[PDB]
Amino acid sequence: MSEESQAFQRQLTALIGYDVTDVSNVHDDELEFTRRGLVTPRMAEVASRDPKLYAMHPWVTSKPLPEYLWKKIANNCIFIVIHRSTTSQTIKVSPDDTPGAILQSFFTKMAEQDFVLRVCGRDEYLVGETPIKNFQWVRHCLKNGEEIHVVLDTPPDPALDEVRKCDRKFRVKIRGIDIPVLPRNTDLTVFVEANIQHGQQVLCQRRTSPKPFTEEVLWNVWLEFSIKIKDLPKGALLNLQIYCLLYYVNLLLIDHRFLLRRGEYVLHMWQISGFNADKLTSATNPDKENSMSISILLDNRAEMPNQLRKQLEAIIATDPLNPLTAEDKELLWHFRYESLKHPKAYPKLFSSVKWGQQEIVAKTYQLLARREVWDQSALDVGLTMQLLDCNFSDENVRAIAVQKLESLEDDDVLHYLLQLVQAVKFEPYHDSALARFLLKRGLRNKRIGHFLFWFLRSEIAQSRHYQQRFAVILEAYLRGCGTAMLHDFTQQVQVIEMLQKVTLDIKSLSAEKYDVSSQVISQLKQKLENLQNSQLPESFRVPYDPGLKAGALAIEKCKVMASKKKPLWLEFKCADPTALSNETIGIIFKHGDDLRQDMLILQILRIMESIWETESLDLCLLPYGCISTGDKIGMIEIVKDATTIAKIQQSTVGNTGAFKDEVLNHWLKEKSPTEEKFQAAVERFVYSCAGYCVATFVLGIGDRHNDNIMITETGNLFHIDFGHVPFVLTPDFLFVMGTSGKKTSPHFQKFQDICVKAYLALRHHTNLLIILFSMMLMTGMPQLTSKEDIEYIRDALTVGKNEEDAKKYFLDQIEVCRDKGWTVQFNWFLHLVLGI
Numbered sequence: 077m078s079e080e081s082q083a084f085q086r087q088l089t090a091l092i093g094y095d096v097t098d099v100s101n102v103h104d105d106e107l108e109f110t111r112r113g114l115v116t117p118r119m120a121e122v123a124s125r126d127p128k129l130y131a132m133h134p135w136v137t138s139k140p141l142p143e144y145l146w147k148k149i150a151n152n153c154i155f156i157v158i159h160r161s162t163t164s165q166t167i168k169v170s171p172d173d174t175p176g177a178i179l180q181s182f183f184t185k186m187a188e189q190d191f192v193l194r195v196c197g198r199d200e201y202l203v204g205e206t207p208i209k210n211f212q213w214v215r216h217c218l219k220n221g222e223e224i225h226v227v228l229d230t231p232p233d234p235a236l237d238e239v240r241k242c243d244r245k246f247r248v249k250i251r252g253i254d255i256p257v258l259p260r261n262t263d264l265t266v267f268v269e270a271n272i273q274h275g276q277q278v279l280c281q282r283r284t285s286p287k288p289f290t291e292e293v294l295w296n297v298w299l300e301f302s303i304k305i306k307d308l309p310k311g312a313l314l315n316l317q318i319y320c321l322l323y324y325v326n327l328l329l330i331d332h333r334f335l336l337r338r339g340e341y342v343l344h345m346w347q348i349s350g351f352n353a354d355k356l357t358s359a360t361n362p363d364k365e366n367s368m369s370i371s372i373l374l375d376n377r378a379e380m381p382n383q384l385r386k387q388l389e390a391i392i393a394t395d396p397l398n399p400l401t402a403e404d405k406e407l408l409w410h411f412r413y414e415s416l417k418h419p420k421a422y423p424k425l426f427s428s429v430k431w432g433q434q435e436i437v438a439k440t441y442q443l444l445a446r447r448e449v450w451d452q453s454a455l456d457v458g459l460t461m462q463l464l465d466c467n468f469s470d471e472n473v474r475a476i477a478v479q480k481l482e483s484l485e486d487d488d489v490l491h492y493l494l495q496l497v498q499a500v501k502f503e504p505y506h507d508s509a510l511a512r513f514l515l516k517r518g519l520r521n522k523r524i525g526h527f528l529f530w531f532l533r534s535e536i537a538q539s540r541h542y543q544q545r546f547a548v549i550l551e552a553y554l555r556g557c558g559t560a561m562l563h564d565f566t567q568q569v570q571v572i573e574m575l576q577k578v579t580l581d582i583k584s585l586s587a588e589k590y591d592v593s594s595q596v597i598s599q600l601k602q603k604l605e606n607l608q609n610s611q612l613p614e615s616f617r618v619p620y621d622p623g624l625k626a627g628a629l630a631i632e633k634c635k636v637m638a639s640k641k642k643p644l645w646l647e648f649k650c651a652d653p654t655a656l657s658n659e660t661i662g663i664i665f666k667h668g669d670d671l672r673q674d675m676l677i678l679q680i681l682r683i684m685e686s687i688w689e690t691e692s693l694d695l696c697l698l699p700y701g702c703i704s705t706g707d708k709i710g711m712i713e714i715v716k717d718a719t720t721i722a723k724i725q726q727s728t729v730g731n732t733g734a735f736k737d738e739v740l741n742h743w744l745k746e747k748s749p750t751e752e753k754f755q756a757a758v759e760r761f762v763y764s765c766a767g768y769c770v771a772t773f774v775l776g777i778g779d780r781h782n783d784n785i786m787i788t789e790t791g792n793l794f795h796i797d798f799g800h801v802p803f804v805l806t807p808d809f810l811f812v813m814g815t816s817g818k819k820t821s822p823h824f825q826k827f828q829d830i831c832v833k834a835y836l837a838l839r840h841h842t843n844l845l846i847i848l849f850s851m852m853l854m855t856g857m858p859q860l861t862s863k864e865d866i867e868y869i870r871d872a873l874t875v876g877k878n879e880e881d882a883k884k885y886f887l888d889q890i891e892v893c894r895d896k897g898w899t900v901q902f903n904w905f906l907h908l909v910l911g912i
């Protein structure tokens with residue numbers, strides 16, 4: 077309302093990367109009515125959250141403790157070490173011992189209860205009445221089986237968490253277009269195309285008379301559609317598309333209020349080149365110079381026979397991307413209530429609901445009137461997401477899913493945070509039950525609120541079609557999470573803006589081909605000194621690792637990796653005085669890359685291992701951290717003590733000269749200090765390899781540029797860059813099992829058996845993996861075919877083929893590999909250096 081209360085706005089913006097008060101892509105005020113429509117949702121939670129509990133965010137699960145670890149509780153008890161300065165006693169603890177209570181046997185049994193347990197090094201806290209074993213720092217420690225180092229210090233000041241308090245038939249008059257600069261070849265023709273849409277189910281389709289392309293065409297032509305006015309389903313999208321195809325733009329038919337839209341509109345259009353989710357937007361081209369601008373006028377019980385119920389659960393058991401027939405659609409829609417009893421039919425039910433009719437929609441709501449089983453039913457997350465995807469426009473159906481997501485402990489939302497944040501490009505309006513459920517859970521704790529942030533900031537920054545929508549949603553969150561949190565976002569905003577002024581100053585002097593002249597590194601450091609003068613603030617949180625405080629600059633260790641694009645190998649002194657070791661913080665800082673792709677893939681992989689935990693299985697997939705910090709630029713985790721599969725073959729055998737086999741087995745032997753740990757690492761390698769097969773194959777990215785498979789000095793391995801044979805299983809890996817070439821041994825005997833037992837494990841979940849993939853492509857990738865590319869995963873998971881068929885299929889897929897050798901990788905070798 078005044079001078080100091082207007083300076084707040086010039087900050088938020090600087091942090092969002094878009095001025096939410098700038099009006100230059102706006103035919104109305106859904107804009108505000110979203111922001112406003114969010115004050116309540118915000119400060120409703122803001123208040124509701126326990127302030128001490130917000131500030132101490134104790135990462136806690138409630139899932140059953142893993143059988144490979146619960147059995148692995150050898151002595152049947154746990155041990156915890158606690159520090160001060162010098163003194164640091166070790167303590168015996170029971171898998172019941174409250175993290176609160178383990179001081180009532182340390183301040184009474186060793187000697188008042190106002191200091192809490194932290195973790196040595198991190199911004200973590202172990203507080204609350206949920207057993208030790210239910211802490212995800214502890215689990216992750218015991219999983220890998222480490223010592224547990226705590227340091228006693230005050231509950232942090234949660235006073236900083238302070239918040240800055242007619243009715244017949246539809247028509248539309250297409251009036252013209254303008255595209256100022258047009259020249260390319262010679263004479264072409266053009267026409268517009270208006271469609272009624274309710275979730276890519278296209279109620280109608282209409283054309284105009286083809287008039288030759290001059291720079292400023294005209295028609296003045298109405299478009300009398302077939303379907304009625306009252307029979308228009310909410311979340312009606314009017315698709316407008318110029319054909320030559322060519323250009324595209326959209327308009328919601330119904331208003332966010334409810335008003336059937338009216339008036340004159342100078343909507344600007346996006347260009348197309350050569351489907352994708354980024355094609356169902358409510359926002360237009362915010363450049364009013366080189367864009368096309370179309371001008372318009374708007375002036376307005378169920379019980380049945382046997383071989384029907386049978387020839388129906390058939391339709392139930394079908395995978396999600398399996399087609400449905402008019403034949404199908406009727407059987408379902410008819411048995412409606414008999415179709416409710418099985419939740420495993422819900423997407424498939426509402427798909428079979430053409431929403432043209434007024435009457436049907438109301439009957440469809442009488443279907444929800446007795447939502448009965450769905451509410452009381454076992455939560456299956458896949459079946460839930462499947463309802464929040466591309467296909468459903470109805471602001472009631474999408475609400476039935478969110479309703480079921482409500483019941484998820486943080487550690488689960490965290491697993492799925494990415495794809496639901498991506499899934500907002502799909503709710504048809506702005507203000508939406510999910511859009512909120514996001515803002516909600518994200519204020520309910522801290523650790524969601526962080527990841528939320530850069531997830532939003534990633535899409536606000538590079539993705540034009542959603543910067544409006546996401547910038548509103550974010551702005552709403554940033555205001556209401558307290559400067560306490562908000563002064564770490566400030567840190568991390570300055571610091572990458574610093575790590576840009578340089579990355580792009582170094583990006584200046586590139587000859588072209590892979591090189592790093594003195595010239596370029598000499599300056600790398602010399603630059604860093606002015607980022608070391610009143611511009612970095614002491615430290616900053618590691619974007620991908622919330623609790624990690626990256627601090628001071630190791631300028632002597634920063635470099636510029638020879639790689640094609642020029643990243644920066646930077647390292648950082650952890651600013652935590654109560655650390656435990658002394659390796660710094662290596663962080664790759666690339667640029668010229670869109671990261672949302674790599675980033676989304678880690679969240680697949682993870683889910684794949686969380687799935688395997690329910691089967692009681694481990695495969696060691698090391699999915700490093702990665703984040704899209706701003707525009708065509710981000711930063712990636714540096715996994716200490718690892719190397720590439722490329723450098724190794726390079727380090728024993730010559731330039732490209734052949735590919736010797738045993739090479740690999742020694743590299744480990746020579747990095748194993750103890751006589752044992754060569755077996756202990758082989759234990760970790762075989763398990764680690766098997767996952768980067770099932771997964772690398774299911775996702776269908778298993779044959780990868782030779783230079784891009786990595787491996788820790790500790791047996792474990794992990795595929796790195798996901799820039800762009802069923803899977804990489806090269807002869808040397810086979811030799812690390814005990815097979816020189818098509819034989820079997822007590823470790824390979826295991827290899828086969830692990831992949832498969834895991835493949836069926838992952839198969840017993842078919843549906844989930846598909847509804848990801850589909851969303852994953854829609855929100856992430858280029859020009860994916862709404863069949864072809866979307867399909868592949870169907871084959872990989874081989875729906876239908878009963879267990880004994882697929883169990884062989886994978887065992888034989890290993891054979892598909894075990895017949896090619898290096899011939900693949902060597903073809904990737906000579907793919908480099910003279911192969912036009």
Ligand SMILES: CC(=O)Nc1nc2ccc(-c3cncc(S(C)(=O)=O)c3)cn2n1
Nearest residue numbers: 643664666700713714715717718796797
């Ligand atoms: C010891 C080491 O170098 N470890 C390590 N860990 C990782 C994890 C990820 C990546 C990486 C992943 N994607 C892309 C890149 S880049 C800098 O080529 O764009 C690098 C590279 N490394 N390197």
